[PDB]
Amino acid sequence: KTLPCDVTLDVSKNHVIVDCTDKHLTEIPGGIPTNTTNLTLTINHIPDISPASFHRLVHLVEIDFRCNCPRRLQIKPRSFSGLTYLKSLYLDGNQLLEIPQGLPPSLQLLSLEANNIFSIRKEQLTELANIEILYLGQNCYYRNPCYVSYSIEKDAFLNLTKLKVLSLKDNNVTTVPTVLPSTLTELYLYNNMIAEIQEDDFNNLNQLQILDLSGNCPRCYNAPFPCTPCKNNSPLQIPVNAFDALTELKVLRLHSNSLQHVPPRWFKNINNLQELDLSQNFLAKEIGDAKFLHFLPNLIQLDLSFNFELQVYRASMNLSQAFSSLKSLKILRIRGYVFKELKSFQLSPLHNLQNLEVLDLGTNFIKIANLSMFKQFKRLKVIDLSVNKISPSCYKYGQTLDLSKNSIFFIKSSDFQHLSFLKCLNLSGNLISQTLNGSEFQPLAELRYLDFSNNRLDLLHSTAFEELRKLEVLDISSNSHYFQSEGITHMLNFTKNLKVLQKLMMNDNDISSSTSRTMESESLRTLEFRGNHLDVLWRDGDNRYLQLFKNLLKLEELDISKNSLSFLPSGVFDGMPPNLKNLSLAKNGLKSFIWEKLRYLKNLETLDLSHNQLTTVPERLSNCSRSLKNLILKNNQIRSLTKYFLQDAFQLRYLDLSSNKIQMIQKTSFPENVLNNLKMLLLHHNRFLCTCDAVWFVWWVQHTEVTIPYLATDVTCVGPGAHKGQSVISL
Amino acid sequence: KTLPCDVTLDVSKNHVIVDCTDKHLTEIPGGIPTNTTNLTLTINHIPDISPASFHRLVHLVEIDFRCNCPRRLQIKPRSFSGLTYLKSLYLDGNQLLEIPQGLPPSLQLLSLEANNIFSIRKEQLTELANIEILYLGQNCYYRNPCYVSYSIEKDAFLNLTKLKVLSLKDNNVTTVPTVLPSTLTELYLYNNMIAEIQEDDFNNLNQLQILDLSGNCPRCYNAPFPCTPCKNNSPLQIPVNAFDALTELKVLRLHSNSLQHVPPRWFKNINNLQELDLSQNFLAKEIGDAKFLHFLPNLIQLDLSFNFELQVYRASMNLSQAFSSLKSLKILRIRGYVFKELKSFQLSPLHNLQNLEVLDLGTNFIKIANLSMFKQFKRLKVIDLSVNKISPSCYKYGQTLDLSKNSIFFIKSSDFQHLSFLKCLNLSGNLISQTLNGSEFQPLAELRYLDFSNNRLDLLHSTAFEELRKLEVLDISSNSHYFQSEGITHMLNFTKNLKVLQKLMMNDNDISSSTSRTMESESLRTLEFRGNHLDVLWRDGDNRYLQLFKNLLKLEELDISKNSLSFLPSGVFDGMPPNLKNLSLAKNGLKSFIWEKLRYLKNLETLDLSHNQLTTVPERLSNCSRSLKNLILKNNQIRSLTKYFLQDAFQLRYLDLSSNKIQMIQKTSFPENVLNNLKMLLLHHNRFLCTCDAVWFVWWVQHTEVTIPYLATDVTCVGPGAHKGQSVISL
Ligand SMILES: *[C@@H]1O[C@H](CO)[C@@H](O[C@@H]2O[C@H](CO)[C@@H](O)[C@H](O)[C@H]2NC(C)=O)[C@H](O)[C@H]1NC(C)=O
Ligand SMILES: *[C@@H]1O[C@H](CO)[C@@H](O[C@@H]2O[C@H](CO)[C@@H](O)[C@H](O)[C@H]2NC(C)=O)[C@H](O)[C@H]1NC(C)=O
Ligand SMILES: *[C@@H]1O[C@H](CO)[C@@H](O[C@@H]2O[C@H](CO)[C@@H](O)[C@H](O)[C@H]2NC(C)=O)[C@H](O)[C@H]1NC(C)=O
Ligand SMILES: *[C@@H]1O[C@H](CO)[C@@H](O[C@@H]2O[C@H](CO)[C@@H](O)[C@H](O)[C@H]2NC(C)=O)[C@H](O)[C@H]1NC(C)=O
Ligand SMILES: *[C@@H]1O[C@H](CO)[C@@H](O[C@@H]2O[C@H](CO)[C@@H](O)[C@H](O)[C@H]2NC(C)=O)[C@H](O)[C@H]1NC(C)=O
Ligand SMILES: *[C@@H]1O[C@H](CO)[C@@H](O[C@@H]2O[C@H](CO)[C@@H](O)[C@H](O)[C@H]2NC(C)=O)[C@H](O)[C@H]1NC(C)=O
Ligand SMILES: C[C@@H]1CN(c2ccc(C#N)c3ncccc23)C[C@H](C(=O)N[C@H]2CNC[C@H]2F)O1
Ligand SMILES: C[C@@H]1CN(c2ccc(C#N)c3ncccc23)C[C@H](C(=O)N[C@H]2CNC[C@H]2F)O1
Ligand SMILES: *[C@@H]1O[C@H](CO)[C@@H](O)[C@H](O)[C@H]1NC(C)=O
Ligand SMILES: *[C@@H]1O[C@H](CO)[C@@H](O)[C@H](O)[C@H]1NC(C)=O
Ligand SMILES: *[C@@H]1O[C@H](CO)[C@@H](O)[C@H](O)[C@H]1NC(C)=O
Ligand SMILES: *[C@@H]1O[C@H](CO)[C@@H](O)[C@H](O)[C@H]1NC(C)=O
Ligand SMILES: *[C@@H]1O[C@H](CO)[C@@H](O)[C@H](O)[C@H]1NC(C)=O
Ligand SMILES: *[C@@H]1O[C@H](CO)[C@@H](O)[C@H](O)[C@H]1NC(C)=O
Ligand SMILES: *[C@@H]1O[C@H](CO)[C@@H](O)[C@H](O)[C@H]1NC(C)=O
Ligand SMILES: *[C@@H]1O[C@H](CO)[C@@H](O)[C@H](O)[C@H]1NC(C)=O
Ligand SMILES: *[C@@H]1O[C@H](CO)[C@@H](O)[C@H](O)[C@H]1NC(C)=O
Ligand SMILES: *[C@@H]1O[C@H](CO)[C@@H](O)[C@H](O)[C@H]1NC(C)=O
């Protein structure tokens, strides 16, 4: 089948999926199966649509036709009336001026985003009486302007009795389109120019659950996007008796509305509100009072970020006592509340929130913060202490103290006292210049993850991190400052004292010398050593560091890549861990990789040599390794394989030679006896010349079921002559 | 003259200087003038020396032979005895094991640095009875080891009655070389392994002026170099009665000696001490006491940097009251004294030093610092407030407040109050995100320079920097954050209100759009606009921003380079300042730079088109411009000049076509009537093919006096065949 689009079959789901994503077709291809259900026609060069485009396809329930656009796109009349079983259609980014007509009554979803439709009338919506979801957003804003306000005729959406989802974002709307259908459940009116809300705007939405009114009359100070604030810097005028009929409301986003007060009368009728967004407002004084929090006992999320007032640097964080009424609160982000010093009793209202897990306090420029005050927030899961200026992922491991990008330049044992419950500690970006001695992280008895990346660490002692008995993952990446120095001791055998260490990231360290001859660990299984200098360590005639990873008995993941290795000295594979399982040598510069030495690795399965400068493939992979399964030779320089490349290599299950200079592949090197089990195989972006010398290649590539991606677009033919750019399956 | 080395003549001085710096010679060339005075033989591949090397050269006064080394250098006996008028000699970095013998008595200077001389005896210094300066440093240290202690026989240097300067730095010295000659004036004994000083070491040095004992018993914590601290972390043991005979001592450097106390008895006899270095020590407690400062009334410089105690973060700087006894103090470095808060009265001892000019307080991690306290240090010249974490060149303009790389994230008018005397304000690296309004820098009435580079500026108002009435130079470079945003207003006409602005740096801003059509200034003379995007501003069919620089009437130097300009639209030269004098378009990417429009610039003199992708030179430079004199077409892609390039063009004074693909140059395009006035001309690293078609080129290049640098090494010949790599003067 010469279809250039992927096909997926789910007989239980009776769905046949044909997707042509980013394939640059100029017309709908012929031969599309009649039993397809999901059709994708995203970014492409399709000129227009016609009734013959979907002539014989009656079992279609989905058409994805997003962002296809010399001029705009035109749709013929009765272009979709023959799609009786149609249920969803995307027409986003097509520069359509008006809603297409003739759509089947069975249509359930319709997306018209990023178009030029700025006028909505009842007559054009008469055919959408059974629609469920309508996406009419992004029709008039700074990225795609229309220079006029959105026009809604009276009761345009009223007769859409089945409508539940309606998004009118980024549409230059001035007033709420009354009257909306009573069956609405999600209303997205955010990022518009609606300046006032009427009391008769939401009388009939009794089933509404999500209401987004974000960006109307926005806070435009230092805004990286074109936004027009309201007149006289007024907030979005919402009456007190506006959210009356909203009884099933669960999400209410009021982000960036320049709000100064939040009346408690707004939350009088919405009993089951779960998420409330109030970011980018002027509620810094309201946070001190926060009377409206007493009407939200079921609130789950509360975003109050970036509510600071300009030219004011507060001495303290003024949280109200009404924050204790948030019984069900879990996530509380109060970023952008810039203030000087964080004290112990400023978080007193949150001391009894049993369901509180995340406490975000980043981007506040906090200077003084006693970390011992967090011994009361042990039940929490994330304690965010981000880019603020405090001076002396991990979420799966337990309690997390994210101290990244602070002003900590040295570590004291007393600073981390009363923090034994910590399971992770993120110290990334602090630029700590310290020679570790094994006593800094003493109170961190239960620490399991320690992030020390983007710092200045000095491995002068092998007793570094010795007191982290329960540490499992250690990240000391991007500490290249002291490792770049030559002649000072670099004790790389500091991992011997770590009894339960499992993973070690120490990459991008520019390590070129080591006093310690070997690295020792009886529990390490993953070690990333990329972006370093093993060429000097494995220099010609230098056998000192050949067995650098031999003593890592349990090591199963070695990531020595980007290490400027022009060649591997003969003998390094003898000094490799016995239990090495997956290996990576990507982006190294490897000129010649010897293959018969791979027999010493009797457990390797995923040798990775992507983005290398190799030239020759092994003579016989079976004689090389008896367990290698997942070869990755992407972006290599290979011109032709061996006559018996995959002979007797039954254990292979993955192969990758994409982006090479290969010319021809014959049968005797690729027997089907092996190819029947290959789960994956890549041979695209290479230099196949499609002459008559590859009759078997032509026959096999278009008649086997071996998975080869991009078999009709990216894997082309270089010759001869008129056969330039030919598809390997079109031969 | 085919000498590949430059020649300089000073008849009044009677020096003829020949220099072969970095010219890779294998042997001293023949034909060297007999009347030469200075000979330079720096880094090269010279195998050895012979008496015939300087056979007939009797008027030689200077020979330079630094860092020329299959094996080391070999010097034959009597290799310098024939140099009667020899006066100075350099043999640095030649791997010599012993001092060469046979040197003339008339030698005044002898440098033997970076060699392998680790043993000094009286017999080999017997010939140096008239030496004045001796540089025996860098003989045994971590970059060039010798694995043994530096050994000197007793009274080896004693009989050198004329010795004045002796540098034994980085030589693995253990004990001072008693007894030194009594006429010593400069002793550089720093960076050694001397742990003890005896009271009988400096008895005869009563004309000594500089004593360097830095790096002995060093402080090796966070040391980026291999340094060995002494036993028990002891300081350099100096007796109290050690600096007794030293009476004319002017400079005493004790940097990195791990000193804990500085007894006042040391400074009892040195009355005229001017510079005192005490950096990288443990004198944090001594600074609080500092009793020794009462014995230095003539001290000019006092370096007390990096005296912090480990794991100690002080709350304040404890400066002693004895700092007021430094009557003549001008220079003061107190960096590395890391502490929390800088208060007003902490600098009270410095309030009465009339000669104090600079006060450096960086690398201290100061958090709270009221900038209004510096209204007392008006007589100062530089107030360094660098990488410290304070939160809310210049030296030729007057008072400087260097607030670079601080923790200031917004600017208040009250913060800079009482700082009207400021002539500079360096706010670079603070990453201030602010929309300037014209009231932030209000108290800065007399500000003449403002560095605001590496920040986040938002040109939303044209009134930015309006209150800086006396501002002359403005630096807003590397503010690409908000300028990268598309659609927001960028008022580039903010310079109209600056009446006396003279220079403007606004580079690396990635500016792609501008609401303002033109830039206005009646006094701007220099404008640097590199690292921006003028290709989109001058996009095809976009005539909005063609006259962006017309209204800069007084502009005389424009720096629109690295701006991704593939081509200049026809008409931009019609939109240029009338008084434009210097112009730069380097590293842009000009595919075709027209020259006939250059007539519109009747004042241009330094059209700079280096590192571009031009192809064709103008037909006639005389018809192009009548005042151009400084072409720079370096690193261009030019293959041949036209037939009448410099025809009738007399006003040019500089020409640069280095690193091109030019092949042949004829006479009619380069008439000597023009070349007699060219001060400079570069034609190296090009692709001349030296066939028989260039007879005039061959004759002229080796018989004219037009200045052409690297005429024998870099400007080579591509052909034909055996003439590959031939020198243009060797033809
Ligand atoms: C193929 O089209 C069908 C019909 O539009 C898609 O089925 C919908 O999937 C979403 C996501 O789970 C559900 O919310 C809808 O209720 C489904 N509708 C129906 C009628 O089943 C299906 O997801 C599409 N397949 C692909 C790969 O896009
Ligand atoms: C949103 O609608 C307003 C109102 O029509 C548009 O404002 C017009 O903008 C054009 C182009 O700048 C002007 O010529 C008109 O005079 C404006 N009219 C008014 C009443 O102000 C605005 O441009 C629209 N926004 C977008 C992104 O198209
Ligand atoms: C420690 O903090 C840094 C800084 O936020 C985290 O780095 C970010 O990680 C997320 C998730 O992987 C990325 O999406 C961001 O791009 C990262 N930002 C930077 C600047 O690196 C880091 O992931 C944190 N450590 C852990 C273990 O999660
Ligand atoms: C050429 O050599 C002479 C002789 O060594 C140099 O003259 C010396 O210059 C220094 C620096 O000014 C003085 O301190 C010495 O007193 C001078 N000595 C004599 C004997 O004149 C001269 O500087 C050298 N010139 C160059 C360009 O290297
Ligand atoms: C400075 O001198 C000391 C003393 O001789 C040298 O120390 C020797 O170093 C070598 C090589 O490491 C050892 O084999 C010797 O045993 C050391 N001797 C002693 C007495 O400790 C030191 O190497 C020298 N420094 C340099 C840079 O050469
Ligand atoms: C403002 O402070 C910055 C930061 O120190 C100065 O930038 C340094 O300038 C010196 C002198 O030109 C250079 O040698 C350094 O390499 C620069 N460092 C950096 C990080 O840029 C800047 O020069 C100061 N402003 C003025 C006018 O001197
Ligand atoms: C959250 C605050 C808002 N800011 C401010 C700008 C102007 C002010 C005035 N007048 C102001 N006044 C008080 C408090 C904050 C102010 C800028 C500041 C900042 O430095 N932002 C960086 C940090 N790294 C990310 C980037 F967003 O962040
Ligand atoms: C000057 C101080 C010395 N430092 C320190 C290291 C270890 C300590 C322990 N125990 C310590 N204890 C107290 C005070 C400072 C300490 C590191 C600190 C620093 O962050 N250095 C960066 C800043 N940007 C340049 C680069 F040098 O600078
Ligand atoms: C019907 O569905 C099957 C699914 O396997 C598909 O192969 C076929 O092309 C479809 N159309 C037919 C049978 O006309
Ligand atoms: C905190 O806010 C409340 C009400 O907003 C106010 O009464 C109180 O004075 C504030 N306290 C501080 C320290 O800002
Ligand atoms: C931090 O809190 C702990 C426990 O309350 C206390 O012992 C310690 O002194 C505090 N540190 C500071 C600097 O206040
Ligand atoms: C690391 O090696 C050094 C010798 O180089 C040794 O003194 C030290 O005990 C070793 N430490 C560990 C943890 O293996
Ligand atoms: C090899 O890499 C894969 C990434 O695709 C990883 O999931 C696996 O754990 C690694 N080790 C193996 C396959 O032994
Ligand atoms: C003498 O000095 C002159 C200086 O102009 C120089 O040209 C000449 O080569 C020297 N040697 C002679 C004249 O032998
Ligand atoms: C300052 O130093 C002196 C002597 O070094 C000491 O007596 C005094 O207590 C110190 N004061 C402070 C605040 O450190
Ligand atoms: C800074 O000093 C000035 C003048 O002494 C004073 O008016 C101002 O209040 C001080 N600011 C702070 C924060 O102490
Ligand atoms: C800059 O131009 C704007 C119009 O774009 C104008 O309103 C403003 O007054 C101008 N300011 C100056 C200083 O020229
Ligand atoms: C142009 O720039 C050069 C830099 O080499 C400078 O010397 C000259 O004074 C400037 N002005 C001119 C040539 O008018």
Tab-separated table of N, CA and C in Angstrom, chain B residues 684-727:
chain	number	residue	atom	x	y	z
B	684	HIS	N	47.225	40.153	3.164
B	684	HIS	CA	47.701	38.854	3.616
B	684	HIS	C	46.545	37.876	3.808
B	685	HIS	N	46.902	36.590	3.883
B	685	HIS	CA	45.945	35.483	3.981
B	685	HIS	C	44.988	35.441	2.792
B	686	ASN	N	45.463	35.840	1.617
B	686	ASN	CA	44.670	35.819	0.398
B	686	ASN	C	45.178	34.719	-0.535
B	687	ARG	N	44.630	34.684	-1.750
B	687	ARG	CA	44.869	33.569	-2.659
B	687	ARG	C	45.628	33.980	-3.915
B	688	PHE	N	46.678	34.786	-3.766
B	688	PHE	CA	47.524	35.122	-4.907
B	688	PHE	C	48.113	33.862	-5.526
B	689	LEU	N	47.960	33.722	-6.841
B	689	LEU	CA	48.680	32.705	-7.601
B	689	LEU	C	49.864	33.395	-8.270
B	690	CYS	N	51.071	32.911	-7.984
B	690	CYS	CA	52.292	33.626	-8.352
B	690	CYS	C	52.859	33.061	-9.656
B	691	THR	N	52.105	33.285	-10.729
B	691	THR	CA	52.529	32.899	-12.064
B	691	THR	C	53.297	34.048	-12.717
B	692	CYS	N	53.559	33.912	-14.016
B	692	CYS	CA	54.291	34.924	-14.766
B	692	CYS	C	53.409	36.086	-15.211
B	693	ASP	N	52.095	36.004	-14.997
B	693	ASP	CA	51.191	37.077	-15.395
B	693	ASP	C	51.278	38.295	-14.483
B	694	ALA	N	52.034	38.214	-13.390
B	694	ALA	CA	52.100	39.292	-12.412
B	694	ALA	C	53.518	39.832	-12.284
B	695	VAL	N	54.161	40.117	-13.419
B	695	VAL	CA	55.527	40.639	-13.396
B	695	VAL	C	55.576	41.972	-12.657
B	696	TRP	N	54.625	42.864	-12.950
B	696	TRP	CA	54.595	44.146	-12.255
B	696	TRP	C	54.332	43.961	-10.768
B	697	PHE	N	53.436	43.037	-10.411
B	697	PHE	CA	53.169	42.777	-9.001
B	697	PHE	C	54.433	42.310	-8.291
B	698	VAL	N	55.169	41.391	-8.921
B	698	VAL	CA	56.407	40.881	-8.336
B	698	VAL	C	57.413	42.010	-8.157
B	699	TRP	N	57.577	42.842	-9.187
B	699	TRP	CA	58.551	43.928	-9.111
B	699	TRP	C	58.164	44.947	-8.044
B	700	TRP	N	56.878	45.298	-7.977
B	700	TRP	CA	56.439	46.380	-7.104
B	700	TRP	C	56.415	45.952	-5.643
B	701	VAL	N	55.963	44.726	-5.360
B	701	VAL	CA	55.776	44.318	-3.968
B	701	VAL	C	57.106	44.280	-3.225
B	702	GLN	N	58.210	44.069	-3.940
B	702	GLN	CA	59.527	43.960	-3.326
B	702	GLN	C	60.414	45.167	-3.611
B	703	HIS	N	59.865	46.232	-4.200
B	703	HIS	CA	60.659	47.418	-4.489
B	703	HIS	C	59.977	48.726	-4.110
B	704	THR	N	58.765	48.695	-3.569
B	704	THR	CA	58.103	49.899	-3.092
B	704	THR	C	58.199	49.974	-1.572
B	705	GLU	N	57.859	51.145	-1.036
B	705	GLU	CA	57.878	51.379	0.402
B	705	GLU	C	56.469	51.484	0.979
B	706	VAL	N	55.481	50.928	0.277
B	706	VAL	CA	54.122	50.888	0.797
B	706	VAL	C	54.048	49.856	1.914
B	707	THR	N	53.527	50.271	3.067
B	707	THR	CA	53.511	49.411	4.245
B	707	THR	C	52.575	48.229	4.027
B	708	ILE	N	53.144	47.028	3.980
B	708	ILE	CA	52.372	45.794	3.855
B	708	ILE	C	52.841	44.826	4.936
B	709	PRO	N	52.046	44.584	5.974
B	709	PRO	CA	52.498	43.718	7.064
B	709	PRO	C	52.545	42.259	6.642
B	710	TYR	N	53.402	41.508	7.336
B	710	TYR	CA	53.531	40.063	7.148
B	710	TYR	C	53.839	39.727	5.692
B	711	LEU	N	54.708	40.533	5.081
B	711	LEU	CA	55.007	40.435	3.658
B	711	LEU	C	55.834	39.208	3.293
B	712	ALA	N	56.354	38.463	4.269
B	712	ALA	CA	57.196	37.310	3.988
B	712	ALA	C	56.703	36.010	4.603
B	713	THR	N	55.672	36.042	5.442
B	713	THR	CA	55.194	34.843	6.120
B	713	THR	C	53.752	34.489	5.794
B	714	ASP	N	52.829	35.446	5.877
B	714	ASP	CA	51.409	35.154	5.732
B	714	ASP	C	50.889	35.326	4.312
B	715	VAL	N	51.385	36.313	3.568
B	715	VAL	CA	50.973	36.515	2.177
B	715	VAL	C	51.819	35.573	1.322
B	716	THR	N	51.246	34.415	1.014
B	716	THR	CA	51.922	33.359	0.277
B	716	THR	C	51.368	33.272	-1.142
B	717	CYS	N	51.888	32.308	-1.897
B	717	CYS	CA	51.488	32.074	-3.276
B	717	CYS	C	50.811	30.714	-3.389
B	718	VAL	N	49.709	30.667	-4.139
B	718	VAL	CA	48.975	29.420	-4.317
B	718	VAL	C	49.542	28.565	-5.448
B	719	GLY	N	50.189	29.173	-6.437
B	719	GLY	CA	50.744	28.435	-7.545
B	719	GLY	C	51.809	29.214	-8.288
B	720	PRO	N	52.268	28.675	-9.428
B	720	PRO	CA	51.812	27.390	-9.963
B	720	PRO	C	52.717	26.215	-9.592
B	721	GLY	N	52.149	25.209	-8.930
B	721	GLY	CA	52.888	24.002	-8.619
B	721	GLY	C	54.006	24.192	-7.616
B	722	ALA	N	55.252	24.142	-8.098
B	722	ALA	CA	56.411	24.232	-7.217
B	722	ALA	C	56.494	25.567	-6.488
B	723	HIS	N	55.790	26.594	-6.966
B	723	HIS	CA	55.785	27.905	-6.329
B	723	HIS	C	54.677	28.039	-5.290
B	724	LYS	N	54.228	26.922	-4.724
B	724	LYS	CA	53.218	26.952	-3.676
B	724	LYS	C	53.856	27.322	-2.343
B	725	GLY	N	53.223	28.255	-1.634
B	725	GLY	CA	53.758	28.726	-0.375
B	725	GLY	C	54.896	29.711	-0.493
B	726	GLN	N	55.224	30.150	-1.706
B	726	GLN	CA	56.303	31.107	-1.895
B	726	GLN	C	55.926	32.468	-1.323
B	727	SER	N	56.923	33.155	-0.774
B	727	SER	CA	56.721	34.503	-0.268
B	727	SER	C	56.617	35.486	-1.427
